[PDB]
Structure 1
Amino acid sequence: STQREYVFIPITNSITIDVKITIGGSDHITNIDERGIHNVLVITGYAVDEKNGRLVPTLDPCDYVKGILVAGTPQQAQSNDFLTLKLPANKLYLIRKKGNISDDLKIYIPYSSPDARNSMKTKPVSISDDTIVNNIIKEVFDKIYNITQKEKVKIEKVKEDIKELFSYYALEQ
């Protein structure tokens, strides 16, 4: 059908893996056109787990992760360790609203088991250390989006929304 997967943008290079299709059909929700990154899907109450990279259940009502969506299935080595769900593309927290969706989604999401064993007192870990972006903008914005650095010159624009808008939180252990 019309498959995708929410991939977040961290400041670690451990999130260059879970994209297989890279195309899906020919479309992608979170697009790049003359204005940078639009359709940023910020998750509520989830945090990231770069080391063994997933999204963790958290409960500070403000806990966000801010990433993107690309039309793909992550690695096919999942569907028990990755979240799979079908909602009619209306329950979304999709910011920088630039496109429209067909009112249905078939998503595949990284996610881990809760493990009520320790204190997961998360930390604000924002997107700094811009050095990571310059391989992020290759491994994803170039190795997935076959138009960045091939049809525009304002690559510093997309290299700026990822500095002010793109952030996240993490369990960080």
Structure 2
Amino acid sequence: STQREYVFIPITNSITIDVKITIGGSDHITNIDERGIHNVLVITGYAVDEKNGRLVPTLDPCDYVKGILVAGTPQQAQSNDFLTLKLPANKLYLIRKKGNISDDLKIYIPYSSPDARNSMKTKPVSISDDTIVNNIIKEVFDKIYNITQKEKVKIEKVKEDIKELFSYYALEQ
């Protein structure tokens, strides 16, 4: 079928654009119908390194990544460092599936080195500073799926679910 990619949504804004697609395929990963962020990709067991973003994998399944299957090609300048996966596409833990996927998908997934150079200890973080919620809504959320500001005159429901529908486990190492 199609190919989708790998994005974390922290208080960080460094994930603006390396997915060069604006329309993609007739199927759409995350849709929004005036109820908030839908079709959230959850990834379990991959700690984050939010500054100098390269998610070092952990072993503990008690950390998660509230990501999105970001539509398209990984810029066709990467994946010599990433990992990648062509799933039978029943395994992706997608929150509140609105449509219906025909379980056919391939996923390129960024990755990093195990970081054996300091004692690992992750921490939970939620999306603070609702103004930075709005600005990450601007940089990354707007120019991937442009139905926002198209039909959406309701931001109080689509910008304040991402408040805590996305929480992660940052290393800071």
TM-score by length of 1: 0.91
Alpha-carbon distance in structure 2 between the residues aligned to 1:43 and 1:59: 12
Report if aligned partners of 2:5, 2:69 keep a CA contact under 8 Å in 1.
Answer: yes
Report if aligned partners of 2:24, 2:71 keep a CA contact under 8 Å in 1.
Answer: yes
Structure 2 unpaired stretches of 5+: none
1:119-158 residue pairs with structure 2 within 5 A?
Answer: 119-158=119-158
Alpha-carbon distance in structure 2 between the residues aligned to 1:8 and 1:128: 15
Report if aligned partners of 1:133, 1:159 keep a CA contact under 8 Å in 2.
Answer: yes
Report if aligned partners of 2:46, 2:58 keep a CA contact under 8 Å in 1.
Answer: yes
Kindly provide the CA deviation profile for residues 110-143 of structure 1, in whole angstroms up to 9, marking residues without a partner as x: 2111132221211112221222221211122211
Kindly provide the CA deviation profile for residues 66-93 of structure 1, in whole angstroms up to 9, marking residues without a partner as x: 0212211232221121221111111121
Structure 1 position 10, deviation (Å): 1.1
Structure 1 position 26, deviation (Å): 4.5
CA root-mean-square deviation: 1.6
Report if aligned partners of 1:53, 1:110 keep a CA contact under 8 Å in 2.
Answer: no
Residue in 2 aligned with 1:35?
35
- Aligned pair count reads 173
Structure 1 position 5, deviation (Å): 0.8
In terms of mean alpha carbon deviation, does 18-27 or 108-117 score higher? 18-27
Report if aligned partners of 2:124, 2:167 keep a CA contact under 8 Å in 1.
Answer: no
* Cα distance change of structure 1 residues 92 and 143 upon mapping to structure 2, 3 Å threshold: same
More helix by share: 1
Identity among equivalent positions (%) equals 100
- The list of structure 1 runs, each at least 4 consecutive aligned residues, that deviate by more than 3 angstroms after superposition, is none
Report if aligned partners of 1:13, 1:136 keep a CA contact under 8 Å in 2.
Answer: yes
Structure 1 unpaired stretches of 5+: none
Structure 1 position 22, deviation (Å): 3.3
Alpha-carbon distance in structure 1 between the residues aligned to 2:32 and 2:110: 23
Report if aligned partners of 1:65, 1:167 keep a CA contact under 8 Å in 2.
Answer: yes
Report if aligned partners of 1:122, 1:171 keep a CA contact under 8 Å in 2.
Answer: yes
* Cα distance change of structure 1 residues 55 and 23 upon mapping to structure 2, 3 Å threshold: farther
Residue in 1 aligned with 2:48?
48
Alpha-carbon distance in structure 2 between the residues aligned to 1:92 and 1:172: 27
Kindly provide the CA deviation profile for residues 12-66 of structure 1, in whole angstroms up to 9, marking residues without a partner as x: 1111133222332244211112221111111101122222213221122211110
Alpha-carbon distance in structure 1 between the residues aligned to 2:34 and 2:151: 10
